[PDB]
Design a protein around this ligand. Structure first.
Ligand SMILES: [Zn+2]
Ligand SMILES: [Zn+2]
Lengths: 705, 705
């Protein structure tokens, strides 16, 4: 002891070297200073009372961190006051815990005892067992027995054999529970606790850690619940793996499933822009790469791989793991070994086998010209999944541009329903209308039914990443009865333009005449539109009755027709223009400008604007658009250039199920995008625009004339 | 030549030493790189066509900066290329200018010839004359004759003798015009142009530069139009003064009126929080200390004073004046002479003699995250003035908390009405309802009439800045017929609380039963209210018909009573709680939660929420409130503490025109604020707060029990 997340050898390395690396010493000293301050308050272990973000919730959180940190500092410094504090905290828990029943402020989740839900109980155990592992050799036998019998063994039993609905779950709850119980198993030398954590309660491998590794990650290391829950589950994954490695290296856990755990870490990094995770599915928008799960995970992977590009990410995190692994990161950074991280375009398969749709990330440019297009062609992702098949997000200039709302939830704010998912998470945040994708008849994909959504996934038709352009194309044939839609999204490098442009082609075919809505949630302030808005007559009414529409105010409608239209907005120092046209036999076309906040008596929803393109009574439609960053606004020096869009118009023609899009530019050049939807790279295609003939080879072609 | 903003000795000093000081070299190289790039485009002088932010507007702007910069670089580096580019630009102007009549894209302002208004013409001249001054050396006689007779002399005459409505103006337009013509006078050796600039067209001193210095600044160096226009006018003030000093040092311009120009520069800095100018009156919210007017002014003042605390601000500006004065700044910064700038509480008198109301800045706390309360008890400030007597702003934690909208205008965005003040600047931004102050009967102060407003100022009753608390108190007797109101605002240090608290007491008395509205414009997301809102029944209607009310949507009304109520919101990592109570005989008390965007078909207004306290059918009211920053939200580490307000309630009693406010805290303690409105330091006062007697001396007292 210790022999878990840190080993005796790690402690020796840290003791010998920590003062020699400034980044590590600064981190250690801050943690030490903060703990010393906390210790001055005495041992404070309150009877459990409060929900998420409430006093007892946050106090028991401060305590598990204190136990872990005191154990670490005892080991590194040899200062007995840290042993005493960790010990006395644990003895207080040991006295209290056997008397605890179900938490009094429970909700619909499995209750904890210390906490309103069992999830936080598992986190408490993951942290606290590390502190115990780090002090155990300095305790009297009676103190060990009291702590083990009073809190650790009863909690481990509670979270495993007493909680099969959680322990056997293939879900982030399951990951945390098996990590907590398995790590306890290693520290206490309890073979049974380790075995059930690895192989499930019945030991057959139908549930447990190994099954989670096999099922929750695709072969690309993409975690099916989405980026936000990927980083969260990454801690119990990487920390239980670390414990397995330090105690049973023969299991070769970091080799398992073609280094799935290593791939999970890189993929977590790859799911961020300007340091923030893509807020698809249930997600909070202030979650970034400095989150401790990725700080610790990066350190472990660096220690294994020696990949010096990880040191770039480490510096961007501005935080370092206080482990033996973190020491290696700090040392490498201090020795000037840092290399730039290779942010790249990727296709991430979803489902265990990678075939259940995919998440595409398309990147182009560098610095403030770095654009990222996210194409959400993924399976449901279980309960946290949103009803947004073929959704997209755009990032540019260090900003989110075309956005995903994330979840309706205020992390650890007790006055917001104990920090838990709000009523509006289901009624607004999960719904299709809340997203940048097709809504049919004001109904959500799969009619907002998670059971149905869980059974289906989009079909990826094409992925391409070149220096000329980037493309993803996917088909959704199961979202609605008698409806199929296909979306192709492109990032195009036009040499004459300062920034890459997005081209979007969303085709829908329906058996019955329908309403088709396509929203665009934008970040910024409207400059102007090419269309005239109808007078709202000094009233804003709720947009629709159900499925998220009840949360939107209609601010203006504007009629549109055959010709492409334009909306231009500003965000910080850059302009963005949305040029759009919809090919359809229906003449009933309108733009709806809407604002979030209807049916929100509790002020749970943020202010937000949206441009919705609506076609009514149509069986067929091709929603075509361009998203173009342009120009410079400098409010400091008081200059402006390039403020007008460089796109004169967008035109579209379909022939024999093949599409041609022509983007006419103000300098007289044009961009031609052609889509055949045929994967045969050698098949030649022809489409007649008017008298103009367009010919190409393969699924797609982009030509700048 | 040059002998204006730089001298021949300055040029020698720069050439000899610019490479030695990193800060100067970085700036010069960045300017040189940008100019070299601009020169590669050739000499481009278009005919005047476009409004503000349009192509010709921004091109003529790039040209005047190029003229100045090429002139400077020719002096410092010697290269013929810089001489020729400045000369060729000026010759193109000389050939075009005599042919120009009124700009074709003029608006209501005095038209320019090069520009849509004459203001920009003046800026062009201020910059361009410096370039000419610096290239005199390498010019032939016929070239000087062409330049002076073709552009400079016609432009100088246009802006002066031909434009009495601007040249005689005691206003920032006047300052820019006299600086432009006066600087031209010095460069051309034209005594007449200098005299009329200093003393006005008729030379009596009724108007012109000297009058502006005596009337537009208070003795404290506060510029009556407000912070945003203070920094703007600061350029022509400080640069014309620089020109006067280098040509006629016997005038002792920097000693004039007890060093008024020096005080003006310090006051400009004192009018910012976290580097941004308080957005009172017409103002844009992205304007900060790195604005070039303050960069140049700071350099001038440092050269005169040697005040090393100005180097702190210089570093925060992140740019350096490319002048001899700027060289001194760079040298001192390189030598490690920087001392921290002393941000402090200040009372700034308004009016020529500082007796026409005042602007109070109250600061408490350390670092760049301290608290700043601004009490706007100032006179009108002419046309750019807002109808917001006794308004207030609050800053905390690097953020604006309780806000001022500034102006409805998009700087140099041509698609937004040529970057000019929008229709909504008058109809929304200037109106009282748009501010954090009293609105009577849905009408603005002075019934929104600038002529009436210009004739009156609030009466300042008290100013105090201590370690215990801070206070401003002011009376507005002239805003409405038969109405008087008084506002006292305090910043209170309560040792048991983590942050100072604001206490607000706004008393109103009216001859007739009236509606009293008190808005609070806040920055952040509502957490919860202590009160119940009425169902809005899925519609938002325009709040009122006139005077800014037509721009607000009513989202919810909520009835309130005798007991204090609370609104709590979150912004970044901190919570803010607004506890409020109104003593009034009227029972008609409601909170209106409103959102901006009605009567805004062009999407000129930002999204914004407001909490308005309304009292109806009342002749008297005391609007009492507490603004309390509290707690910590960490979205990265996922922790929260102190999320609930520590204020249990707020109570108020009035006795013989004297107020007592009791702030009951959750720990059982209380804060007692007493106000007598009697300036006599030794006068004893007594108020019976129920079964309690409150006794104190002086205008105010604050006691923590
Ligand atoms: Zn979503
Ligand atoms: Zn204002």
């Amino acid at each position: 002891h210790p022999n878990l997340i840190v080993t005796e050898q790690d402690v020796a390395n840290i003791a010998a070297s920590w003062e020699s690396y400034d980044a590590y010493a600064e981190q250690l000293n801050a943690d030490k200073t903060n703990l010393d301050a906390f210790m001055a308050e005495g041992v404070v272990v309150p009877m459990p009372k409060d929900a998420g973000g409430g006093y007892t919730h946050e106090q028991h959180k401060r305590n598990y961190k204190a136990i872990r940190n005191a154990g670490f500092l005892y080991q590194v410094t040899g200062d007995e006051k840290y042993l005493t504090f960790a010990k006395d905290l644990l003895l207080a828990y040991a006295k209290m815990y056997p008397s605890l029943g179900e938490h009094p402020n429970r909700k619909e989740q499995s209750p904890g005892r210390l906490f309103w839900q069992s999830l936080n109980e598992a986190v408490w155990l993951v942290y606290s067992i590390q502190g115990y592992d780090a002090i155990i050799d300095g305790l009297a036998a009676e103190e060990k027995q009291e702590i083990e019998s009073g809190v650790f063994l009863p909690m481990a039993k509670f979270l495993s054999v007493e909680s099969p609905e959680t322990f056997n779950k293939i879900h982030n709850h399951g990951t945390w529970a098996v990590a907590a119980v398995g790590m306890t198993g290693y520290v206490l030398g309890n073979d049974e606790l380790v075995e059930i954590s690895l192989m499930g309660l019945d030991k057959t491998g139908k549930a447990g850690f190994m099954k989670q590794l096999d099922k929750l990650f695709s072969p690309d290391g993409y975690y099916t619940e989405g980026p936000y829950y990927q980083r969260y589950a990454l801690m119990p994954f990487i920390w239980f793996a670390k414990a397995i490695e330090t105690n049973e290296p023969e299991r070769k856990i970091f080799e398992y499933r073609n280094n799935i755990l290593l791939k999970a870490v890189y993929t977590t990094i790859d799911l961020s822009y300007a340091g923030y995770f893509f807020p698809i599915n249930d997600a909070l928008k202030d979650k970034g790469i400095d989150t401790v799960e990725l700080v610790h995970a990066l350190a472990i992977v660096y220690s294994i791989t020696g990949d010096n590009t990880l040191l770039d990410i480490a510096q961007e995190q501005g935080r370092i793991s206080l482990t033996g692994d973190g020491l290696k990161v700090a040392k490498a950074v201090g020795e000037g070994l840092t290399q730039p991280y290779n942010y790249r375009s990727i296709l991430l398969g979803d489902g265990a086998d990678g075939d259940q749709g995919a998440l595409s990330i398309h990147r182009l440019g560098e610095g403030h010209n770095h654009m990222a297009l996210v194409a959400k062609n993924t399976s449901q992702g279980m309960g946290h999944g949103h009803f947004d098949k073929l959704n997209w997000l755009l990032y540019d200039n260090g900003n989110e541009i075309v956005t995903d709302y994330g979840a309706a939830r205020y992390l650890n704010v007790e006055a917001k329903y104990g920090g838990h998912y709000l009523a509006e998470n289901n009624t607004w945040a999960k719904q299709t209308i809340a997203h940048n994708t097709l809504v049919v008849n004001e109904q959500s994909h799969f009619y907002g039914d998670v059971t149905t959504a869980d059974l289906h996934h989009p079909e990826v038709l094409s992925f391409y990443s070149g220096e000329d352009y980037q493309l993803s194309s996917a088909k959704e044939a199961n979202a609605y009865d008698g409806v199929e839609f296909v979306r192709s999204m492109l990032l195009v490098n036009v040499p004459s333009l300062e920034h890459p442009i997005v081209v979007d082609v969303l085709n829908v075919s329906a058996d019955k005449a329908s309403t088709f809505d396509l929203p665009l949630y934008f970040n910024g302030q409207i400059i102007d539109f090419s269309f005239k808005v109808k007078d709202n007559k000094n009233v804003m009414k709720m947009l629709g009755k159900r499925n998220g529409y009840q949360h939107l105010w209609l601010r203006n409608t504007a009629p549109v027709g055959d010709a492409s239209e334009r909306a231009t907005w500003i965000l910080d120092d850059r302009f963005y223009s949305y040029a759009f046209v919809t090919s359809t036999p229906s003449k009933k076309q309108n733009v709806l400008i809407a604002e979030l906040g209807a049916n929100d008596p509790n002020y749970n929803l943020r202010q937000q604007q949206v441009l919705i393109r609506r076609v009514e009574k149509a069986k067929q439609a091709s929603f075509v658009s361009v998203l173009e960053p342009h120009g410079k606004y400098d409010g400091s020096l008081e200059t402006t250039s390039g403020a007008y869009s460089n796109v004169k118009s967008v035109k579209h023609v379909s022939e024999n199920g093949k599409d041609v899009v022509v983007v006419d530019l103000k300098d007289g050049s044009n961009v031609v995008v052609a889509l055949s939807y045929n994967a045969n790279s050698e098949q030649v295609h022809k489409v007649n625009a008017g008298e103009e003939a367009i010919e190409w080879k393969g699924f797609s072609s982009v030509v700048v004339r």
